[PDB]
Paper text:
By rationally engineering the surface residues of a model anti‐VEGF nanobody, we obtained a series of anti‐VEGF nanobodies with identical protein structures and VEGF binding affinities, while drastically different crystallization propensities and crystal lattice structures. Anti‐VEGF proteins have been the cornerstone of wet AMD therapeutics, and approved anti‐VEGF proteins include ranibizumab, aflibercept, conbercept, brolucizumab, and bevacizumab (off‐label use). Here, we successfully changed the crystal lattice arrangement of therapeutic nanobody (termed mNb‐WT) by rational mutations of surface residues, which remarkably reduced the dissolution rate of protein molecules from the crystal into the solvent. In summary, our findings demonstrated that the protein crystalline form can be modulated by rational surface mutation without impairing pharmaceutical efficacy.
Unexpectedly, mutant 7, replacing Q14 with N14, resulted in a radical change to the protein arrangement in the crystal lattice. The space group of mutant 7 turned into a P212121 lattice from the P1 lattice in mNb‐WT with only one protein molecule in the asymmetric unit. The crystal morphology of mutant 7 was prismatic crystals instead of lamellae. Unlike mNb‐WT crystals, mutant 7 recruited zinc ions rather than sulfate ions to help align protein molecules in the crystal lattice. Every mutant 7 molecule interacts with another asymmetric unit mediated by two zinc ions. At the first zinc binding site, the side chain of the D60 residue in asymmetric unit A, the side chain of the D111 residue in asymmetric unit B, and two water molecules formed a strong coordination unit with the zinc ion; meanwhile, the two water molecules also created typical hydrogen bonds with the D60 and R108 residues of asymmetric unit A and the D111 residue of asymmetric unit B to strengthen the periphery of the coordination unit (top diagram). The other zinc coordination unit consisted of the side chains of residues D73 and K76 in asymmetric unit A, the side chain of residue E45 in asymmetric unit C, and one water molecule. Interestingly, these two coordination units were identical not to the conventional zinc binding motif, the classical zinc finger motif 29 or histidine‐mediated zinc coordination among protein molecules, 30 but rather to the central catalytic core of metal‐binding proteins, such as retroviral integrases. Unexpectedly, the solvent content of the mutant 7 crystal was 21.92%, the minimum among the protein crystals, indicating the most compact molecular arrangement. For the P212121 lattice, zinc coordination of the mutant 7 crystal further strengthened the molecular interaction, leading to a slower release rate than mutant 2 crystals.
Author numbering: 4 to 26, 29 to 61, 66 to 126
């Protein structure tokens, strides 16, 4: 029900906007996670149903309910940022449990971001 878009080749120090389009979006808290080469999964950032954000300050989140979309902005890319980025939706209200993958029920396919130069 979720599709991430926008990944690609990007420069260190650059900026990148990813989008996660949802197929009743307003009733879900939305989170972004990432899996880098080697690393295990990392929480990135989440925005609750109510509009409140939970952070892991280069990664920011907005939700356009009227476009059924959540955006991840990465400002000032770093080599650590090479990863597949996953969007996820949870039926939970906002809490620090939105930093945990186990809280989410629906997930996207991921979009790959490669920091290079
Ligand atoms: Zn914060
Ligand atoms: Zn809009």
């Amino acid at each position: 029900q979720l599709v991430e878009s926008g990944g690609g080749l990007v420069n260190p120090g650059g900026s990148l906007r990813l989008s996660c389009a949802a197929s009743t979006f307003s009733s879900y808290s939305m989170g972004w996670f990432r899996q880098a080469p080697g690393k295990e999964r990392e929480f990135v950032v989440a925005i609750s149903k109510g509009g409140y954000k939970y952070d892991a300050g280069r990664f920011t989140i907005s939700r356009d309910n009227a476009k059924n979309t959540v955006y991840l902005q990465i400002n000032s890319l770093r080599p650590e940022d090479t990863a597949v980025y996953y969007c996820a939706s949870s039926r939970a209200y906002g809490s620090s449990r939105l930093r945990l993958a186990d809280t989410y029920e629906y997930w996207g396919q991921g979009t790959l971001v490669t920091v290079s130069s």
